Scaffold this motif. Sequence first.
Motif, PDB file in Angstrom:
ATOM      1  N   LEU B  40       0.736  -1.237  -0.053  1.00  0.00           N
ATOM      2  CA  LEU B  40      -0.105   0.044  -0.050  1.00  0.00           C
ATOM      3  C   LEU B  40       0.749   1.146  -0.165  1.00  0.00           C
ATOM      4  O   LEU B  40       0.379   2.125  -0.393  1.00  0.00           O
ATOM      5  CB  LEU B  40      -1.112  -0.075   1.116  1.00  0.00           C
ATOM      6  N   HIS B  44       0.357   4.162  -2.758  1.00  0.00           N
ATOM      7  CA  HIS B  44       0.235   5.531  -2.529  1.00  0.00           C
ATOM      8  C   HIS B  44       1.366   6.894  -2.908  1.00  0.00           C
ATOM      9  O   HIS B  44       1.176   7.901  -3.039  1.00  0.00           O
ATOM     10  CB  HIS B  44       0.272   5.833  -0.695  1.00  0.00           C
ATOM     11  N   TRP B  55      -6.883   8.171  -3.543  1.00  0.00           N
ATOM     12  CA  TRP B  55      -7.102   6.848  -3.307  1.00  0.00           C
ATOM     13  C   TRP B  55      -7.404   6.780  -1.658  1.00  0.00           C
ATOM     14  O   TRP B  55      -6.549   7.567  -0.800  1.00  0.00           O
ATOM     15  CB  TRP B  55      -6.038   6.059  -3.757  1.00  0.00           C
ATOM     16  N   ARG B  56      -7.968   5.779  -1.277  1.00  0.00           N
ATOM     17  CA  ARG B  56      -8.023   5.243  -0.170  1.00  0.00           C
ATOM     18  C   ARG B  56      -8.396   3.707  -0.125  1.00  0.00           C
ATOM     19  O   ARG B  56      -8.814   3.215  -1.104  1.00  0.00           O
ATOM     20  CB  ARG B  56      -9.206   5.709   0.716  1.00  0.00           C
ATOM     21  N   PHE B  57      -7.587   3.103   0.907  1.00  0.00           N
ATOM     22  CA  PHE B  57      -7.663   1.717   0.824  1.00  0.00           C
ATOM     23  C   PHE B  57      -8.129   0.996   2.216  1.00  0.00           C
ATOM     24  O   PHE B  57      -7.576   1.386   3.173  1.00  0.00           O
ATOM     25  CB  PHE B  57      -6.128   0.864   0.666  1.00  0.00           C
ATOM     26  N   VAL B  58      -9.262   0.103   2.135  1.00  0.00           N
ATOM     27  CA  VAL B  58      -9.858  -0.435   3.288  1.00  0.00           C
ATOM     28  C   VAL B  58      -9.627  -1.860   3.461  1.00  0.00           C
ATOM     29  O   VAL B  58      -9.832  -2.533   2.372  1.00  0.00           O
ATOM     30  CB  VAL B  58     -11.013  -0.016   3.649  1.00  0.00           C
ATOM     31  N   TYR B  59      -8.827  -2.398   4.252  1.00  0.00           N
ATOM     32  CA  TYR B  59      -8.073  -3.749   4.305  1.00  0.00           C
ATOM     33  C   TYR B  59      -8.508  -4.646   5.460  1.00  0.00           C
ATOM     34  O   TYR B  59      -8.726  -4.113   6.444  1.00  0.00           O
ATOM     35  CB  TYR B  59      -6.611  -3.796   3.732  1.00  0.00           C
ATOM     36  N   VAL B  91     -10.420  -0.526  -2.879  1.00  0.00           N
ATOM     37  CA  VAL B  91      -9.595   0.696  -3.461  1.00  0.00           C
ATOM     38  C   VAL B  91     -10.900   1.671  -3.590  1.00  0.00           C
ATOM     39  O   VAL B  91     -11.788   1.463  -4.181  1.00  0.00           O
ATOM     40  CB  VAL B  91      -9.125   0.571  -4.681  1.00  0.00           C
ATOM     41  N   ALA B 114      -6.931   6.700  -9.084  1.00  0.00           N
ATOM     42  CA  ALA B 114      -7.078   5.605  -8.373  1.00  0.00           C
ATOM     43  C   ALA B 114      -6.647   4.168  -8.928  1.00  0.00           C
ATOM     44  O   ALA B 114      -5.760   3.278  -8.455  1.00  0.00           O
ATOM     45  CB  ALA B 114      -8.323   5.426  -7.949  1.00  0.00           C
ATOM     46  N   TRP B 118      -3.869   1.404  -8.033  1.00  0.00           N
ATOM     47  CA  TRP B 118      -4.284   0.113  -8.040  1.00  0.00           C
ATOM     48  C   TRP B 118      -3.120  -0.876  -8.801  1.00  0.00           C
ATOM     49  O   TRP B 118      -2.599  -1.577  -8.283  1.00  0.00           O
ATOM     50  CB  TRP B 118      -5.397  -0.231  -8.522  1.00  0.00           C
ATOM     51  N   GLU B 156     -14.255   1.905  -6.038  1.00  0.00           N
ATOM     52  CA  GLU B 156     -13.490   1.440  -7.228  1.00  0.00           C
ATOM     53  C   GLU B 156     -13.574   0.013  -7.466  1.00  0.00           C
ATOM     54  O   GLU B 156     -13.895  -0.524  -8.742  1.00  0.00           O
ATOM     55  CB  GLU B 156     -12.136   2.067  -7.465  1.00  0.00           C
ATOM     56  N   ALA B 157     -12.887  -0.663  -6.909  1.00  0.00           N
ATOM     57  CA  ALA B 157     -12.781  -2.140  -6.828  1.00  0.00           C
ATOM     58  C   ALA B 157     -12.340  -2.791  -5.494  1.00  0.00           C
ATOM     59  O   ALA B 157     -11.835  -2.320  -4.845  1.00  0.00           O
ATOM     60  CB  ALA B 157     -11.712  -2.384  -7.872  1.00  0.00           C
TER      61      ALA B 157
END
Lengths: 200, 198
Positions: B40, B44, B55-59, B91, B114, B118, B156-157
């Motif tokens: 990640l 970034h 972008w943000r990422f939740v994981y 994403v 984004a 990715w 997004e995905a």
Amino acid sequence: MTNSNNRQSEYPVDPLFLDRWSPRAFDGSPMPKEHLLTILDAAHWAPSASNHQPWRFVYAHKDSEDWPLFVELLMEGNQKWAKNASVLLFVISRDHTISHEGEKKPSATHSFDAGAAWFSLAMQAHLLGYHAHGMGGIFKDRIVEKLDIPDGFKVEAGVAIGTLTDKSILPDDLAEREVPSKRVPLADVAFEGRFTGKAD
Amino acid sequence: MTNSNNRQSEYPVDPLFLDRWSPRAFDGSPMPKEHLLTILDAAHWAPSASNHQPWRFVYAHKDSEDWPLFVELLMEGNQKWAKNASVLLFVISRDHTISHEGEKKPSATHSFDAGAAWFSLAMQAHLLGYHAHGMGGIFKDRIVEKLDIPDGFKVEAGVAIGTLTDKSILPDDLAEREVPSKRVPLADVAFEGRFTGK
Ligand SMILES: Cc1cc2nc3c(=O)[nH]c(=O)nc-3n(C[C@H](O)[C@H](O)[C@H](O)COP(=O)(O)O)c2cc1C
Ligand SMILES: Cc1cc2nc3c(=O)[nH]c(=O)nc-3n(C[C@H](O)[C@H](O)[C@H](O)COP(=O)(O)O)c2cc1C
């Protein structure tokens, strides 16, 4: 962590991710035709929803009969430096899927997928010793008209590619910006479990 | 021209572009926390318009309290295989910016940007010996609800990341598809001077 290209990452990223950057001082030299094709070949290997491959690229070399058209399709500010790049191109995407029968369906991911192709483009350019520089300061409607972009295709971004040279060739305000940009802390964009960041 | 990963390029691309691919057979092993952060972190570092970094990422890790939720936010055809990945994440992109004085302005490039993050994610995953697999077959409105995504942020995905294993674990239709995908000829998408395709 990694220290590379006047940047420091919080984690041991491959230095390639810090070394890729978007300067403005280009030497105006010709780029070998095969080098550009390699760059676009890497770009077209990107992943995409359903392997639809919605990206398109319309390009011109510095020696092209249409170079000045490609330059004047950028806004004045960008023209000032991008006119000295080796290659100019526009990244385009099909905003729908179309069937054997010509039936159109809106694409949920075409711009996203085009971005993946663009990073791939920038990365391959980097790997060959060039720098790519994305541009949104462009005349999208004029691009569509002048470059014969069909209906249902979107102009995502312009891209200038070339060989880096001394910042002294730039006007002072751009020369002062000729330094690799920074990023927010990883924790400001990567959240475990749920969205914990501020909305603004 | 390049040969790697059962793919063939027309021009001498770095074999990393051929070697990166999206399998479905994952071994369910834990991924070290630092490895995902490195992935990640690479993401970034992508470029974005105005360096907005939308972008943000939740994981979640497979060992997570949240794992069942993350799996259930994928459509069933994706769950079948992605439930065995080491990490699942979404994403997300910020679709706007807001001025000092409070005026909200739509972002023209937030999904595009984004997408660059990715690819960067997927490449860094690849370089660490993993594989990332993007997913649009997901329940976006349920993702927004369950993961507390604020207004003006777009899903997004989904992405599954893990360590490849033998395709024998997959059902036959997926086994048949557990091979590196191909691409159209370059000349079908890259045009000199004017758009000439179709
Ligand atoms: C789609 C997009 C549009 C951009 N438009 C412009 C622009 O019109 N003018 C410019 O000078 N830079 C432009 N950039 C460059 C970004 O500001 C730059 O990529 C960002 O600051 C990150 O820096 P880096 O690429 O050197 O890592 C654009 C970048 C993106 C990807
Ligand atoms: C945004 C996008 C959405 C995707 N959605 C799915 C999906 O829901 N299910 C699936 O199995 N693969 C999905 N994929 C995988 C693509 O089909 C795959 O990346 C493409 O065929 C190219 O193959 P490669 O990534 O192995 O090179 C998705 C990929 C992208 C980037």
